[PDB]
Design a protein that fits this description.
Pathway: Organosulfur biosynthesis; taurine biosynthesis; hypotaurine from L-cysteine: step 1/2
Number of strands: 13
Family: Belongs to the cysteine dioxygenase family.
CATH architecture: Sandwich
Bound molecules: 2-amino-4-mercapto-butyric acid, fe (iii) ion
Number of helices: 3
Pfam family, one: CDO_I
Distance between the termini: 40 Å
Catalytic activity: L-cysteine + O2 = 3-sulfino-L-alanine + H(+)
Structural class: mainly beta
Helix content: 10-25%
Strand content: 35-45%
CATH topology: Jelly Rolls
Radius of gyration: 16 Å
Shape: globular
Protein name: Cysteine dioxygenase type 1
Number of domains: 1
Order of helices and strands: HHHEEEEEEEEEEEEE
Largest sheet: 7 strands, mixed
Strand order of the largest sheet: 7-4-9-2-1-12-13
Length: 186
């Protein structure tokens, strides 16, 4: 029975219930993530920015079933065009706005990756992506407002691919956590 999360802590407890089994009800997970109303005090501990690029801050390891993390995007910070390593990926805005640009999987032949579509994800909205849907880029295009987002991936992954927009060529990337459970992890 899906109830509204009263706090981030409550959200985490609910997510543990929803991932207790071997499968994922994506619509239920998205609904509960959307239903949590971002409260900056509850996640300030995790909102550790870097001047030069976005940061990934681990919040919960989901008893192995998922990683829950907070990403902090300075003005002008964005991601590569990337995949999600055969995992479910949910993205909820906690602060600010992010531009999501969708791309198709490239063909073998080298070619410009043309954007399929784009949308602006606004505060408290939750997006969902997986490799069967396509690839995406996520960017804070604001000149004046930092953005903060809450990401859930299941199963957890720490490697993915970045795609060259000019050719479609992919390279393996390993991502690191800027912090874990509020502690900077250089
Ligand atoms: N998956 C990316 C963030 C955009 S969804 C990352 O883990 O850094
Ligand atoms: Fe992504």
């Amino acid at each position: 029975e899906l109830l509204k999360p009263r706090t981030l802590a409550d959200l985490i407890r609910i997510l543990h219930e929803l991932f207790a089994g071997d499968e994922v009800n994506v619509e239920e997970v998205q609904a509960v993530l959307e239903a949590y109303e971002s409260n900056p005090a509850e996640w300030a501990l995790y909102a550790k920015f870097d001047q030069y690029r976005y940061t990934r801050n681990l919040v919960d390891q989901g008893n192995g079933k998922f990683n829950l993390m907070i990403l902090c995007w300075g003005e002008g910070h964005g991601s590569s065009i990337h995949d999600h390593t055969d995992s479910h990926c949910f993205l909820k805005l906690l602060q600010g706005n992010l531009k999501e640009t969708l791309f198709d999987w490239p063909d073998k032949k080298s070619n410009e990756m043309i954007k399929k579509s784009e949308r602006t994800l606004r505060e408290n909205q939750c997006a969902y992506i997986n490799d069967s849907i396509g690839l995406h880029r996520v960017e804070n295009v604001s000149h004046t407002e930092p953005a903060v987002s809450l990401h859930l991936y299941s199963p957890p992954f720490d490697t993915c691919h970045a795609f060259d927009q000019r050719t479609g060529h992919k390279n393996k990337v390993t991502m690191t956590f800027h912090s874990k459970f509020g502690i900077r992890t250089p």
